[PDB]
Amino acid sequence: VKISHTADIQAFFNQVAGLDHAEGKPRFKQIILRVLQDTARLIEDLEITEDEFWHAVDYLNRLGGRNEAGLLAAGLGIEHFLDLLQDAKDAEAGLGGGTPRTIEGPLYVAGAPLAQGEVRMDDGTDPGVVMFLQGQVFDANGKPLAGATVDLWHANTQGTYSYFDSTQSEFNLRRRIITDAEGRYRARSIVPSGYGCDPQGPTQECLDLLGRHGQRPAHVHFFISAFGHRHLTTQINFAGDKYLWDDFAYATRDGLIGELRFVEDAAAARDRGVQGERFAELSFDFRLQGAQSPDAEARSHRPRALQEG
Amino acid sequence: VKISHTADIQAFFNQVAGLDHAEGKPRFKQIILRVLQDTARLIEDLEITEDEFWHAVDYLNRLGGRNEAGLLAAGLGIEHFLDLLQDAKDAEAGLGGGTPRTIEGPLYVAGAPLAQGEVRMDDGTDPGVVMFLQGQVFDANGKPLAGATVDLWHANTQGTYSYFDSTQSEFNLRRRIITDAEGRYRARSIVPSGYGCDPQGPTQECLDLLGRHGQRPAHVHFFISAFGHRHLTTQINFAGDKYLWDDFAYATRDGLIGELRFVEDAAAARDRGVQGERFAELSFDFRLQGAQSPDAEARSHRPRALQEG
Ligand SMILES: [Fe+3]
Ligand SMILES: [Fe+3]
Numbered sequence: 218v219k220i221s222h223t224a225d226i227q228a229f230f231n232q233v234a235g236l237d238h239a240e241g242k243p244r245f246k247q248i249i250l251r252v253l254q255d256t257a258r259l260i261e262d263l264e265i266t267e268d269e270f271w272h273a274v275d276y277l278n279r280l281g282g283r284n285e286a287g288l289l290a291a292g293l294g295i296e297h298f299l300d301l302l303q304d305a306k307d308a309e310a311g312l313g314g315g316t317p318r319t320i321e322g323p324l325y326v327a328g329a330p331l332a333q334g335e336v337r338m339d340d341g342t343d344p345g346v347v348m349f350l351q352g353q354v355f356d357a358n359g360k361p362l363a364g365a366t367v368d369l370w371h372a373n374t375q376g377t378y379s380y381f382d383s384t385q386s387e388f389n390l391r392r393r394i395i396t397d398a399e400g401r402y403r404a405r406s407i408v409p410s411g412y413g414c415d416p417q418g419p420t421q422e423c424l425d426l427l428g429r430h431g432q433r434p435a436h437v438h439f440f441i442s443a444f445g446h447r448h449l450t451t452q453i454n455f456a457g458d459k460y461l462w463d464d465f466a467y468a469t470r471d472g473l474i475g476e477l478r479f480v481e482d483a484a485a486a487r488d489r490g491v492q493g494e495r496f497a498e499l500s501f502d503f504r505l506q507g508a509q510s511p512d513a514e515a516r517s518h519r520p521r522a523l524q525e526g
Numbered sequence: 527v528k529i530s531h532t533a534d535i536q537a538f539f540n541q542v543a544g545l546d547h548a549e550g551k552p553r554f555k556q557i558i559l560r561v562l563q564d565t566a567r568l569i570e571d572l573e574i575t576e577d578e579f580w581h582a583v584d585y586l587n588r589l590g591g592r593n594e595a596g597l598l599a600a601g602l603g604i605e606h607f608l609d610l611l612q613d614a615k616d617a618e619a620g621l622g623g624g625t626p627r628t629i630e631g632p633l634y635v636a637g638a639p640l641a642q643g644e645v646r647m648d649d650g651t652d653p654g655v656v657m658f659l660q661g662q663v664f665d666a667n668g669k670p671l672a673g674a675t676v677d678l679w680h681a682n683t684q685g686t687y688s689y690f691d692s693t694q695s696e697f698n699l700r701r702r703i704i705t706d707a708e709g710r711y712r713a714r715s716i717v718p719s720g721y722g723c724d725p726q727g728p729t730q731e732c733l734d735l736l737g738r739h740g741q742r743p744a745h746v747h748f749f750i751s752a753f754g755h756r757h758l759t760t761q762i763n764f765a766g767d768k769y770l771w772d773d774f775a776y777a778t779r780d781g782l783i784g785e786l787r788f789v790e791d792a793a794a795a796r797d798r799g800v801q802g803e804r805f806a807e808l809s810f811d812f813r814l815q816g817a818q819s820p821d822a823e824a825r826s827h828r829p830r831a832l833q834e835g
Contacts, residue, residue: 281586286587286590
């Protein structure tokens with residue numbers, strides 16, 4: 218039984234959307250008219266039962282109250298899909314950039330501590346592997362851009378991010394590094410762990426029904442931007458991780474894999490500001506695009522922890 | 527730019543849905559494959575911006591955390607739409623019932639105090655108008671059904687429901703009345719007020735953008751069921767309410783309007799177990815349908831406050 222195609226019902230969705238008056242935005246009205254016609258068709262095409270419909274509405278309350286809506290768009294590949302479409306859109310406008318882009322994720326936090334060229338990122342709490350992170354920011358041509366900001370955040374060895382994990386100290390593993398004259402950034406930190414969604418959370422309960430896992434490879438998030446250049450959201454995925462190419466949020470891309478190198482020496486005392494038995498080294502450069510508007514460097518208006526806007 | 531129609535993207539949604547393995551439910555897989563193809567098309571057909579997309583994901587967190595998902599399906603006419611489809615479905619199976627059905631609403635609470643034939647519903651707290659509620663439960667033929675349960679709940683004079691409003695006492699304005707030999711129920715209570723959504727809540731902020739109001743007429747909710755009869759969810763809407771036929775959840779239907787009668791007498795001392803100056807009287811009967819399965823009386827599995835199932 219299909220009633221959604223009758224004028225009787227199109228007239229009803231019409232008034233729900235608000236086309237019954239002159240207040241509100243003629244934009245949502247068009248979007249809600251659409252969201253309603255489509256929602257109705259699924260229900261009629263897949264014959265969703267009342268029980269299915271109401272468990273969805275309720276799941277939706279729980280997804281909301283654990284605050285995992287961004288985590289689910291990510292797990293359903295919706296976030297990756299947007300970058301694909303952003304890419305196809307750039308192909309048309311002929312904006313063949315430098316470093317590829319990849320999903321942002323739901324765990325960013327504004328205003329992290331700021332530093333010139335060098336910074337240590339960890340609070341010296343963990344039994345991790347020190348990781349030395351370094352590279353340059355490049356221009357459209359292949360040149361050093363002094364003064365670009367590389368905004369980075371990553372999980373700790375337990376695989377969690379500060380701020381959401383209260384056990385962690387303020388902005389742990391979170392910093393804004395300013396590139397120096399040679400356009401480089403240096404970061405002393407720790408190898409982050411891959412992580413999974415909360416096993417008893419809304420996102421995973423959905424993935425379970427999909428028969429899917431909710432794991433991600435060890436990675437490091439970046440927000441890179443420079444006066445007169447196009448803002449870039451990307452990640453460095455660590456080489457060798459079991460999930461490198463099986464990420465539940467499908468963010469891993471070619472050219473986005475970091476090659477990690479291990480240096481072993483019980484006594485790394487002299488030679489590099491280290492001390493012993495082992496540490497990681499990783500170098501990765503970002504190449505930006507010429508901006509063609511202030512819009513270019515500006516981050517989405519996506520809401521984020523602490524941007525208080 | 528449309529990429530959603532390419533095999534490259536259909537293959538991607540395919541693996542997201544979980545068709546990449548043998549675990550999970552082949553049902554969600556089909557539903558999520560669909561929810562993803564459609565979501566993608568809106569984005570491509572209405573050219574939703576990244577900012578729009580991410581404010582929606584965030585709105586979705588707030589809708590979840592105030593727990594108004596049911597209140598929004600109601601405001602967008604989604605709940606009414608289901609009863610319409612349930613109706614069209616009954617027309618085919620030739621189930622031309624008694625009293626029409628109408629949306630349940632998001633504020634039911636299980637296990638309310640139980641009573642034989644008569645009960646008082648209020649805790650004697652308000653400066654309301656006493657309301658006398660009475661009627662019978664009828665069979666498919668027009669006869670009294672002794673022993674049917676009429677499960678009712680309604681707002682108080684401030685226009686709120688107990689349980690969600692902590693200021694109210696336990697199960698205030700909430701009861702399960704058992705019909706007597708003559709198949710009737712009697713209820714001494716108070717005239718409820720119409721109510722609006724929370725003005726600074728997720729639902730209303732949406733309706734605002736639709737230019738719409740979030741008000742409902744004064745009403746009384748009913749769950750009516752009897753051994754061997756089809757369970758009915760309905761409302762009685764009070765006559766004369768400004769919003770009788772302008773309900774933001776579109777529940778008002780013909781044959782669902784209660785005709786309220788006012789009796790005035792400073793001294794209603796003797797004659798009816800009253801006392802003075804004014805009270806309301808309302809009589810309404812429910813006519814049920816022959817059940818043709820236990821499914822018939824069983825309430826949806828819709829999750830509800832306290833059913834602890
Ligand atoms: Fe992450
Ligand atoms: Fe109500």
